[PDB]
Structures are given as C-alpha cells and as structure tokens.
Amino acid sequence: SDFVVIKALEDGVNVIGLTRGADTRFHHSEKLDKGEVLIAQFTEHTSAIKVRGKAYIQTRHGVIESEG
Amino acid sequence: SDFVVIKALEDGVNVIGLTRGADTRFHHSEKLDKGEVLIAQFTEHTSAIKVRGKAYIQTRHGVIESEGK
Amino acid sequence: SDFVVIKALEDGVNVIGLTRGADTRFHHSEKLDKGEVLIAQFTEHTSAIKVRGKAYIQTRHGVIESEG
Amino acid sequence: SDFVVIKALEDGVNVIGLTRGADTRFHHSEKLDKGEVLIAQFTEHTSAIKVRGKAYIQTRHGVIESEG
Amino acid sequence: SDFVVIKALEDGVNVIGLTRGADTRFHHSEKLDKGEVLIAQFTEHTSAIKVRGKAYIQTRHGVIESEG
Amino acid sequence: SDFVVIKALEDGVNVIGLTRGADTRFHHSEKLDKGEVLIAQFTEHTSAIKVRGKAYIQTRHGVIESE
Amino acid sequence: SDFVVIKALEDGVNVIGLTRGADTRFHHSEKLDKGEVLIAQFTEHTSAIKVRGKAYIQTRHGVIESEGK
Amino acid sequence: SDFVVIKALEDGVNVIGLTRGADTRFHHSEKLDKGEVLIAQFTEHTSAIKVRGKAYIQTRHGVIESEG
Amino acid sequence: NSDFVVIKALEDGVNVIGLTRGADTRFHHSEKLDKGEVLIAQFTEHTSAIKVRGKAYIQTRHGVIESEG
Amino acid sequence: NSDFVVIKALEDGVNVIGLTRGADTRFHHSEKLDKGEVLIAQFTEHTSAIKVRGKAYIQTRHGVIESEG
Amino acid sequence: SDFVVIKALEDGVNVIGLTRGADTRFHHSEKLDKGEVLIAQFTEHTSAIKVRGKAYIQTRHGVIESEG
Ligand SMILES: N[C@@H](Cc1c[nH]c2ccccc12)C(=O)O
Ligand SMILES: N[C@@H](Cc1c[nH]c2ccccc12)C(=O)O
Ligand SMILES: N[C@@H](Cc1c[nH]c2ccccc12)C(=O)O
Ligand SMILES: N[C@@H](Cc1c[nH]c2ccccc12)C(=O)O
Ligand SMILES: N[C@@H](Cc1c[nH]c2ccccc12)C(=O)O
Ligand SMILES: N[C@@H](Cc1c[nH]c2ccccc12)C(=O)O
Ligand SMILES: N[C@@H](Cc1c[nH]c2ccccc12)C(=O)O
Ligand SMILES: N[C@@H](Cc1c[nH]c2ccccc12)C(=O)O
Ligand SMILES: N[C@@H](Cc1c[nH]c2ccccc12)C(=O)O
Ligand SMILES: N[C@@H](Cc1c[nH]c2ccccc12)C(=O)O
Ligand SMILES: N[C@@H](Cc1c[nH]c2ccccc12)C(=O)O
Numbered sequence: 075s076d077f078v079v080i081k082a083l084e085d086g087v088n089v090i091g092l093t094r095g096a097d098t099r100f101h102h103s104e105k106l107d108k109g110e111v112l113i114a115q116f117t118e119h120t121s122a123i124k125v126r127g128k129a130y131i132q133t134r135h136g137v138i139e140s141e142g
Numbered sequence: 143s144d145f146v147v148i149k150a151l152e153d154g155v156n157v158i159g160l161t162r163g164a165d166t167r168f169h170h171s172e173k174l175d176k177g178e179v180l181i182a183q184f185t186e187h188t189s190a191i192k193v194r195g196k197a198y199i200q201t202r203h204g205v206i207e208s209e210g211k
Numbered sequence: 212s213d214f215v216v217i218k219a220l221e222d223g224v225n226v227i228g229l230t231r232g233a234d235t236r237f238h239h240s241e242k243l244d245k246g247e248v249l250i251a252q253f254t255e256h257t258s259a260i261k262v263r264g265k266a267y268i269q270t271r272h273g274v275i276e277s278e279g
Numbered sequence: 280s281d282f283v284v285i286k287a288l289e290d291g292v293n294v295i296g297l298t299r300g301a302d303t304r305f306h307h308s309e310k311l312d313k314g315e316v317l318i319a320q321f322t323e324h325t326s327a328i329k330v331r332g333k334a335y336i337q338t339r340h341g342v343i344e345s346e347g
Numbered sequence: 348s349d350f351v352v353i354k355a356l357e358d359g360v361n362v363i364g365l366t367r368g369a370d371t372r373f374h375h376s377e378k379l380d381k382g383e384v385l386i387a388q389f390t391e392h393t394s395a396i397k398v399r400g401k402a403y404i405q406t407r408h409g410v411i412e413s414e415g
Numbered sequence: 416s417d418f419v420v421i422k423a424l425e426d427g428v429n430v431i432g433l434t435r436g437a438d439t440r441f442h443h444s445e446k447l448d449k450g451e452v453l454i455a456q457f458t459e460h461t462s463a464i465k466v467r468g469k470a471y472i473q474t475r476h477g478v479i480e481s482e
Numbered sequence: 483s484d485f486v487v488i489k490a491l492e493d494g495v496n497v498i499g500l501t502r503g504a505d506t507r508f509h510h511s512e513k514l515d516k517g518e519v520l521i522a523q524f525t526e527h528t529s530a531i532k533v534r535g536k537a538y539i540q541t542r543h544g545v546i547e548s549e550g551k
Numbered sequence: 552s553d554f555v556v557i558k559a560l561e562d563g564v565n566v567i568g569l570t571r572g573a574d575t576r577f578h579h580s581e582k583l584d585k586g587e588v589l590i591a592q593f594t595e596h597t598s599a600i601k602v603r604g605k606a607y608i609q610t611r612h613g614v615i616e617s618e619g
Numbered sequence: 620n621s622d623f624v625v626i627k628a629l630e631d632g633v634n635v636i637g638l639t640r641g642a643d644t645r646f647h648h649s650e651k652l653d654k655g656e657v658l659i660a661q662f663t664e665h666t667s668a669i670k671v672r673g674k675a676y677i678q679t680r681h682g683v684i685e686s687e688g
Numbered sequence: 689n690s691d692f693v694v695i696k697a698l699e700d701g702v703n704v705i706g707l708t709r710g711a712d713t714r715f716h717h718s719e720k721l722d723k724g725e726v727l728i729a730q731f732t733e734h735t736s737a738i739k740v741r742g743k744a745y746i747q748t749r750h751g752v753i754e755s756e757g
Numbered sequence: 758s759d760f761v762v763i764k765a766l767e768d769g770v771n772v773i774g775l776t777r778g779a780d781t782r783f784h785h786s787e788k789l790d791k792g793e794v795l796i797a798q799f800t801e802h803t804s805a806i807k808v809r810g811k812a813y814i815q816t817r818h819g820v821i822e823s824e825g
Contacts, residue, residue, distance in 0.1 A: 076145060077484060077524070078181055079539075079546055091506070095186050098159070098170040102506040104532070109549030111539060113486050114530035116145065119504050122172070122182040131179060132145075132543035135200040138147055141177035144214060146250055164256050166228070167238040184214065190241070190251035199216075201250060203269040206216055209246030214301065215318055233324055235296070235307040253282065259309070259319040268284075268316060272337035275286055278314030283386055301392055303364070303375040311395060321350070327377070327387040336352075338386060340405035341353055346382030349418060351454055352473075362419070368459055371443040395445070395455040403419075404452060408473035411422055414450030417554065419590055428589040437596055439568070439579040457554065463581070472556075472588060475611040479558055482586030485622060485662070487677075489684055499644070510644040512668070515685030521624055521679060524667040527642055540681040552689055555728055559734060573734050575706070575717040593692070599719070599729040608694075612747035615694055618724030620758055623799065625821055637781070648781040650805070655824025657814060659761050660805040665779050678818035693796050708797070711802055713774070713785040737787070737797040746794060750815035751762055754791060756792030 077115040079132040080125055082106035084132035084142065089114065094121035145183040147200040148193055149175035152210065155195030159188035166190070214252040216269040217262055219243035221279065224264035226251060231258035282320040284337040285330055287311035289347060292332030296325035307336070350388040352405040353398055355379035357415060360400030363385060367394035418456040419464055422481075423447035427441040428468030430455060435462035485523040487540040488533055490514035492550055497522060502529035527551030554592040556609040557602055559583035561619060564604030566591060571598035623661040623677040626671055628652035630688060633673035635660060640667035692730040694747040697721035699757060701733055702742035704729060709736035760798040761806055762815040765789035767825060770810035772797060777804035 080089050087106040091114075092098055101119060106112055106129075114123060125131060125140040148157050155174040159182070161167055169187065174180055174197070182191060193199060193208040219227050224243040224273040229235050231254075238256065243266070245247055251260060263269060285294050292311040296319075297303050306324060311317055311334070319328060330336060330345040353362050362385050364375040374392060379385055379402070387396060398404060400414045421430050428447040432455075434440055442460060447453055448469070455464060466472060466481045488497050495514040501507050502525075509527065514520055514537070522531060533539060536550035557566050564583040570576050571594075578596065583589055583606070591600060602608060604619040626635050633652040637660070639645050652658055652675075653661060660669060671677060674688040695704050704727050716734060718748040721727055721744075729738060740746060742757040763772050766810035770789040774796070775781055784802060790813070791793055797806060808814060 075484075075524070076183075077541075079541055079543055081548070082545055092172075092182075094185060096169070098172070099144055101504070103507070104500070105531070106532075107534075109536075109538075109551075111533045111546055111548040112530060113532075113539075113541060114500075115524055116143075117502060117529045120529075121185045121188075122180060124172075124174075124181075125179045129179075130546075131181075132541070132546065133145075133147055133181060133200070134543065135147055135202060138149055138179055138198075138200065140149065140179040144212075160241075160251075162254060162256075164238070166241070184212075189254045189257075190249060192241070192243075193248045193250075197248075199248060199250075201214075201216060202268075203216055203271065206218055206248060206267070206269065208218070208246055208248040211244060211246065229309075229319075231322060233306070235309070251322055258322045258325075259317060261309075261311075261318075262316045268318075270282075270337070271339060272284055272339065274283055275316060275335070275337065277286065277316040277327055280348075281388075297377070297387075299390060301374070303377070321348075321388055326390045326393075327385060329377070329379075329386075330384045336384060336386075338350075338352055340352055340407065343352055343384060343405065344393070344404070345354065345384040349456075354482070365455075367458060369442070371445070389416075389456055394458045394461075395453060397445070397447075397454075398452045406418075406420060406454060406473075408420055408475065411420055411452060411471070411473065413422065413452040429573065433581075433591075434596060435596075437578070439581070457552075457592055462594045462597075463589060465581070465583075466588045466590075469586075472590075474554075474556060474590065474609075476556055476611065477587060479556055481558065481588040481609070483621070483662075486678070487679060487684055489680055489686065509642070512638075512644070512670070514670075519671045519675075519677060519684060519686040520668060521671075521677075522638075523662055524639060525667045527640075527669075538684070540679070540684060542681060544681075553692060569719075569729075573716070575719070593690075593730055598732045598735075599727060601719070601721075601728075602726045608728075609749070610692070610694055610728060611703060612694055612749060613746060615726060615745070616694055617696065617726040623759060623816075625816055625818055627821055627823070647779070648782065650775075650807075652807075657808045657812075657821055657823040658805060658814060659807075660775075661759075661799055663777060663804045666804075676821075678816070678817065678821065690758070707787070707797075709800060709802075711784070713787070718768055731758070736800045736803075737795060739787070739789075740794045740796075744794075746796075748760075748762055748796060748815070750762055750817065753762055753794055753813070753815060755764070755794040 078114045081130040082110050082129040087129045090124040092118040092122040143183050147181050149179045149198045151196040155197050158192040160190040162189035217249045218267040219247050220265040224266045227261040228257035232273035280321045285317045286335045287315050290324035292334045295313040295329040297327040352386045354403045356401040360402045363397040364393040365395040411415045420454050422452045422471040424469040428470050431465040432461040433463035487521050489519045489538045491536040495537050498532040499528035500530040552592045558588045558607045560605040564606050567601040568597040569599035621662040626658045627676045628656050629674040630654050634672050636670040637666040638668035690731045695727045696745045697725050698743040705739040706735040707737035721734050763795045764813040765793050766811040770812045773807040774803035775805035
C-alpha cells in the first residue's frame with residue numbers, strides 16, 4: 075500500500091488526513107517542526123492527504139514541494 | 143489503488159470527486175489555495191476526479207497542468 | 212484499475228462513458244471547458260470512453276490528441 | 280483488463296466488438312468521426328475488437344494503423 | 348489475459364481460433380480485408396490462434412509477419 | 416498463461432502438443448504451411464510443445480529457429 | 483509490506499510509530515543514538531512513522547534527511 | 552509456470568522429466584532429432600528437467616548449452 | 620515472501636536486534652555477530668522492525684547503508 | 689511457480705543434492721551429472737535447499753556462479 | 758520465496774538456519790567445503806541465515822562476502 079514522505083521546511087507544517095468513505099472531512103492533523111519527516115500511508119481511514127506549509131514531498135510519482 | 147498529486151498554483155483551485163456507480167455527480171469539492179498539495183486516491187466512492195483552476199498535476203502517466211477560466 | 216487523463220484544449224469538450232455490459236450506450240457526458248482536466252477510471256459501469264472536441268489525452272500507452 | 284486506444288483519422292471509422300464465448304459475432308459497432316478518440320477495454324462481453332477505416336491505434340504492444 | 352494484434356496486408360486474411368480443451372479444431376475464422384485490424388484475446392474458448400494470408404502481427408514477443 | 420509464436424519457413428511444419436499430467440504423449444499436431452503463423456498457449460491439456468520442420472519461433476526467452 | 487531505513491546522525495533520534503485505524507496517536511518512540519540503524523515496517527499497528535532528530539532516511543522513494551532540533 | 556526451450560544440435564538428444572514429490576525418478580524421455588525444438592514447462596508432475604546430448608537451451612536465466 | 624536485510628559485521632560484537640510485531644514493541648532477541656560474519660534476516664510474524672548496533676555494512680532493497688559503533 | 693537453478697556439469701560425477709523442506713533437514717536425493725549434461729531443478733514442496741558438489745556452471749536469478757571440485 | 762547463494766571460499770564454511778517463530782535459535786548447520794555451492798531458501802522453518810567462514814554470497818540485494 076502507497077505512502078508519501080513529507081519533510082517540513084519550516085515550523086508548523088500541517089499534514090492533514092481526509093476520511094475515506096462517502097463523506098469527506100479531515101480526521102487528523104499531524105504538525106511537523108522544521109526538519110522533521112513524516113512517512114504516511116494511505117489506509118482504511120485515510121484516502122487523501124493534504125499538506126499545508128513549506129514541505130518537500132516524495133511520492134511514487136516523484137518530488138513535489140508545498141509552499142505556505 | 144492509484145492516486146493523483148495536485149498542487150494549487152493560485153487560490154481557489156477545486157479538486158472535485160465524481161461518484162462511482164451508474165450515477166455520475168460531484169460528491170465533494172476540495173478547495174485548495176496557492177501552494178497547497180492534495181494527494182488523492184481513487185476509491186470505492188470516487189472513480190473520476192476533475193480539477194478546476196491553475197494546478198500542477200502528477201499521475202502515474204506523468205505531469206499535466208490544469209489552467210483556470 | 213486504469214485511468215485516462217483528459218485536458219480540454221477548447222470549450223465544450225465531452226468525455227463520454229459507454230456502459231459496461233451486453234448493451235453499449237452513452238450513460239454520462241462530462242463537459243470540460245478549456246483548461247479543465249478530468250482523470251477518469253474504467254469502472255464497473257464504464258468499459259469504454261469517448262472523447263469529442265479538442266483535448267490532450269494521456270493513458271498508460273502514451274499521449275494522444277482528439278480533434279473537434 | 281487491457282484496453283486499446285483508437286483515434287479516427289477520417290469520418291465513419293468503425294470500432295466493432297466481437298462477442299466473448301463459444302459463438303463469435305459482432306455485438307456492437309461504434310462509429311467515430313474524424314478526430315474522435317475511443318478508449319475501449321476487453322470485457323466480459325468483448326474478447327476481440329476489429330477496426331475498419333483509417334485510424335491510429337495504440338495497444339500495450341505499441342502503435343499500429345488501420346487503413347480505409 | 349494476452350492478446351495478439353493482426354493488420355491485414357492484403358484481402359481475405361483469415362484469423363482462425365482453435366478450441367481450448369482436449370479437442371483441437373477451428374471454431375471460428377475471421378476474415379480481414381486489406382488494412383483492417385483485429386485485436387484478439389486468448390480466452391476460455393480460444394487457446395491457440397492461426398493467421399493465414401499476408402499480415403503484420405504484434406504480440407508481447409514483438410513483431411512477426413505471416414505470408415500468403 | 417504463456418504462449419509461443421511459430422512461423423513456418425517451409426511447407427509441412429508440425430506444431431505438436433504434449434499432454435499435461437502423469438503421462439506424456441502427443442494429443443494434437445497442427446500442420447503449418449509456408450508463411451502461416453500459429454500462436455499457441457500452454458494450457459490445461461498442453462504442458463509441452465514440440466516443433467518439427469523449419470520455423471522461426473518466439474517466446475518470452477527470445478527467438479530460436481527449428482530446422 | 484514497505485519499510486523505511488533510519489540511520490541516526492546524532493544522539494537521541496526518535497523513530498515514532500503512529501497508530502493505524504480511526505484513532506491516531508503515538509504508540510511507541512524508539513530512541514537511536516549516533517550511528518545506529520533501525521529498519522522499520524508499516525504494520526497492522528503502525529500506518530505512519532515520524533522521525534525527529536538528525537537522521538539519514540531511505541525509503542522506496544529514495545533518500546531523505548531529517549534535521550535536528 | 553516457467554518453461555525451458557531446448558533445441559537439439561545433434562540427433563538423439565534427450566529431454567528427461569524428473570518426478571515431483573518425495574520420490575525422484577525419471578518419468579519420461581522425449582527424444583529430439585537435430586534441429587527439433589521442444590518448449591517444456593515445469594508442472595504438477597515434473598519439478599526438474601535434465602538434458603543429455605548437444606543442445607542450445609534458453610531459460611529465464613539466459614542461454615546455456617549442453618554437450619554430448 | 621517478506622523482505623530481508625543483509626548485515627555483515629565489520630567488527631566483533633555487532634547486535635542485530637529483532638523488535639516485536641504487534642501492539643507492543645520490545646526487543647525479543649539480539650543476535651550477536653563477530654567480525655566478517657553475515658546474517659540475512661527476514662521480517663516475519665514476530666519481527667516487524669530490526670535495529671543494528673555496532674559497525675556493519677547493511678544491504679536492503681533500498682540500497683546500502685552502514686551502521687557505526 | 690517456484691524459482692529454479694540451472695546446473696551444467698563441467699566434469700564427470702557432479703552431484704546436485706536436494707535438502708528436505710521442513711523441520712528435518714537431510715539429503716533426500718543426489719542427481720549425478722556427467723560432463724556437459726544440464727539439470728534445471730526447482731525448489732519444491734520437498735526441496736528447500738540445493739547443494740552442488742564438483743565442477744559446474746550454475747545460473748540462478750542472481751546470476752552466474754561456479755562450483756569447483 | 759527468496760533464496761541466498763553461498764559459495765565456500767575455504768573448507769568448513771558453516772551455513773546456519775535460524776528458527777522462524779517467537780523463539781530464535783539455530784536448527785541446522787550445513788557445512789561446505791571449498792568450492793561447494795549451497796542455494797538455500799527462506800522457509801516455513803528458516804527465517805534468518807548466518808554464514809560463518811570465508812564465502813562469496815549472492816542475494817537479490819547483490820553480492821556480499823563473509824570473512825572467516
Ligand atoms: N471521502 C472521499 C475522499 C477522497 C478521495 N479522493 C478524492 C478525490 C476528490 C474528492 C474527494 C476524494 C473518498 O474516499 O472517496
Ligand atoms: N459514475 C461513473 C464515473 C466515471 C468514471 N469514468 C468515466 C468516464 C466517462 C464518464 C463517466 C465516468 C462510473 O463509475 O463509471
Ligand atoms: N458494452 C460493451 C462496451 C465495449 C467495451 N469495449 C468495446 C469494444 C468494442 C465495442 C464495444 C465495447 C462491453 O462492455 O463489452
Ligand atoms: N468468441 C471468441 C472470440 C475470439 C477471441 N479471440 C479469437 C481469436 C480467433 C477467433 C475468435 C476469437 C472467443 O471468446 O474465444
Ligand atoms: N485444444 C488445445 C489447443 C492447443 C493450445 N496450444 C497447443 C499447442 C500444440 C497443440 C495444440 C494446442 C489446448 O487447449 O491445449
Ligand atoms: N506430461 C508431462 C509433460 C512434460 C512437461 N514438461 C516436461 C519436461 C520433460 C518431460 C516431460 C514433460 C507433465 O505434464 O509433466
Ligand atoms: N510493534 C510495532 C513495531 C514497529 C514496526 N514499525 C514501527 C515504526 C515505528 C515504531 C514502531 C514500529 C509494530 O508492529 O507496529
Ligand atoms: N490513524 C491514521 C494514521 C495515518 C496514516 N496516514 C495518515 C495521513 C494523515 C493523517 C493520519 C494518517 C490511519 O491509520 O489512517
Ligand atoms: N525467530 C525470529 C528470527 C528472526 C528473523 N529476523 C530477525 C531479526 C532479528 C532477530 C531475530 C530474527 C523470527 O522468526 O522473527
Ligand atoms: N522429487 C524432487 C525432485 C527435485 C526438484 N528439485 C531438486 C533439486 C535437487 C534434487 C532433487 C530435486 C522434488 O520434487 O523436490
Ligand atoms: N529443512 C530446512 C532446510 C533449509 C532451507 N534453508 C536453510 C538455511 C540454513 C539451514 C537449513 C535450511 C528448511 O526447510 O528450513
């Protein structure tokens with residue numbers, strides 16, 4: 075099952091898990107300080123992940139960068 | 143299951159999930175502001191995804207760019 | 212399950228689902244205006260997809276372009 | 280399942296599905312006008328596909344061109 | 348399931364399905380005229396295919412040409 | 416399931432199927448004349464394939480030629 | 483199932499497992515001192531992993547580095 | 552299941568199937584005359600294959616030749 | 620059919636520590652390696668994370684990495 | 689569907705030995721190859737390790753290796 | 758299921774199978790003399806393998822050498 079890597083490029087990056095299912099809203103927000111890395115899967119409860127704030131992101135389709 | 147990456151290139155971008163099944167309609171519109179990235183799967187409930195607004199998009203088939211009205 | 216990416220290159224492009232099953236008829240026509248992108252799977256309900264109007268198309272077999 | 284991409288290079292191209300099963304006959308003929316694109320799977324009902332008319336075709340095996 | 352692509356390079360090319368099972372015989376022969384393409388799967392009923400007549404053939408193993 | 420492509424390079428080529436199972440014998444021989452192509456899977460009934468006569472063969476492991 | 487490799491580049495690096503399921507919380511924090519290596523899977527109990535502290539990280543998407551505190 | 556291609560480079564080559572199971576013995580020898588090709592799978596009944604005589608052999612791991 | 624890691628000890632007394640799979644996380648075994656020995660160790664029903672202490676050359680599916688003592 | 693090894697005897701009296709699968713490990717069969725004969729042998733429900741003695745050219749999915757008598 | 762290739766570079770190389778399960782101990786040691794090769798799988802009974810002595814080793818992750 076797929077995962078994304080998120081490296082925070084500043085304090086307070088917000089990695090937001092959206093609920094899997096007929097309804098969509100966020101069910102968890104994990105904040106990262108600058109330099110921290112989160113490696114997070116798609117799961118039974120999370121089917122979309124949003125990143126807010128400056129982050130360096132890797133997925134199976136390559137590198138992408140969120141800007142705050 | 144496959145996923146698409148969408149990075150908003152201006153405020154107010156909408157990533158719209160279309161319902162899976164005989165019926166086709168919008169069930170959710172996720173609004174993205176400039177700089178934010180959404181990584182969204184295809185799912186039991188979403189079998190097509192529409193992007194309105196300027197965005198940089200990656201899928202397994204490569205990069206594509208939506209342009210806003 | 213695979214999908215196809217369609218970017219509309221002018222207004223009023225139609226992405227048409229054809230029904231899976233013994234019967235083949237339309238079922239849904241999604242209208243894309245210029246610059247809009249639709250990323251659409253093959254599904255239990257849709258086993259063929261037609262594009263009408265000018266669009267840039269990506270599939271697992273590469274790029275192709277429809278013309279209006 | 281595998282799918283084929285067909286781009287009509289002239290009007291009145293026919294993409295014809297042959298029935299899966301002990302019997303082989305045409306169950307459906309999809310007419311494409313010049314410039315239209317049909318992306319069509321193999322399915323429970325369709326185990327062979329015939330293209331009549333000038334078209335550009337992609338399959339997992341690469342490009343091939345049908346001629347009028 | 349695998350498929351073979353056949354482009355007829357002359358009229359009257361025959362793409363012949365051989366029966367799956369203990370018995371081997373021809374259950375169907377599809378006639379292609381010049382420039383027609385047939386894309387044909389292996390199936391529950393067809394476990395070998397024979398092409399007779401001049402054609403350009405693609406499979407997973409590459410290109411081969413039959414001659415009349 | 417995998418397949419073999421055989422192109423006959425002369426008349427009279429035989430593509431022979433061998434029975435799956437505890438016992439091994441020929442259950443079918445398909446005759447190919449010059450230029451005809453057969454594409455043949457391994458199956459419930461055929462676990463080995465013999466080619467006799469001159470033909471160009473392709474498999475997943477590349478090209479080989481019978482004489 | 484996928485794994486990540488983490489090599490601590492200073493003392494006191496934490497490799498933190500987040501719970502799988504509807505509830506998300508830390509359920510374990512593995513402390514690495516400098517030069518130690520942990521190779522950790524995703525599991526029925528861990529669906530996300532956070533690294534805090536200076537570390538060299540390998541995943542199937544390649545090399546990433548966490549930067550300390 | 553994997554298969555092996557054996558092309559006999561002299562008469563009398565033997566392709567020998569060894570029994571699957573706790574017992575190991577030869578259950579069949581297929582004799583190949585010069586220039587014959589045999590394409591043979593691993594099966595419920597055959598878990599090792601021995602070749603005797605001069606032959607050009609292909610497997611998933613590349614070419615090897617046997618010599619008489 | 621799980622993944623495995625290759626650990627070659629570059630000095631005596633390297634420890635390859637298996638961590639328990641499941642809700643709880645603890646060391647269930649430390650295999651001690653002397654210099655020049657190679658351990659090839661899978662992830663398993665009982666081991667979902669592996670810690671290496673001491674100097675070792677390591678190979679996994681994501682490449683080479685080295686632990687330091 | 690299992691993996692297999694190709695063994696080409698480079699001298700007479702080469703032995704390809706099958707070791708039993710399961711809790712008990714012993715030799716259950718030894719196949720004698722004379723010079724230039726080839727054996728293509730799978731791992732099986734009965735054979736979970738294969739030993740080659742004598743001079744032979746061996747191909748696995750990991751590449752070529754050679755045994756020396 | 759994965760396997761390791763071990764080529765003894767001196768006499769008395771010991772290939773040691775460790776028990777799968779909650780407990781860890783060795784359940785078999787297979788000694789190799791110089792120039793013998795052992796191709797050993799991971800199995801229902803062996804989930805870790807230790808090599809002692811000078812040996813050339815291939816795994817899916819490449820070559821490694823043990824030193825005795
Ligand atoms: N609840 C939605 C979340 C989602 C996933 N991908 C999407 C694409 C667009 C809009 C919403 C979504 C679902 O599981 O389908
Ligand atoms: N409800 C439709 C959504 C859809 C997916 N792919 C399409 C292609 C064309 C039109 C509609 C669709 C379905 O699941 O089939
Ligand atoms: N209803 C048809 C739709 C179809 C898919 N592929 C085709 C190719 C040709 C003609 C029709 C089709 C089916 O499910 O089989
Ligand atoms: N009814 C036939 C259609 C077919 C598929 N591949 C073919 C090849 C040759 C002739 C017929 C066919 C079948 O399902 O098998
Ligand atoms: N009825 C045969 C047809 C066949 C497939 N491949 C073959 C190779 C040789 C001879 C016959 C065949 C079968 O299903 O097995
Ligand atoms: N009846 C044998 C045929 C066979 C397959 N592969 C072989 C290799 C060698 C000799 C015989 C065979 C079987 O199914 O096993
Ligand atoms: N007992 C934990 C061990 C573990 C695996 N990967 C981890 C990542 C971080 C922290 C703990 C772990 C589990 O099976 O899930
Ligand atoms: N409990 C959450 C943990 C998680 C995984 N991926 C995430 C992405 C964003 C936020 C939370 C998560 C889950 O298993 O789904
Ligand atoms: N009995 C242990 C053996 C093992 C596998 N990999 C390990 C890594 C470290 C320590 C022990 C092991 C198990 O099956 O899990
Ligand atoms: N009867 C043995 C035959 C065998 C397969 N591979 C081997 C390797 C060595 C010795 C014997 C064999 C088995 O099925 O397991
Ligand atoms: N009977 C043992 C044989 C074995 C396979 N791989 C090994 C590695 C080392 C020692 C023994 C083995 C097993 O099935 O597990």
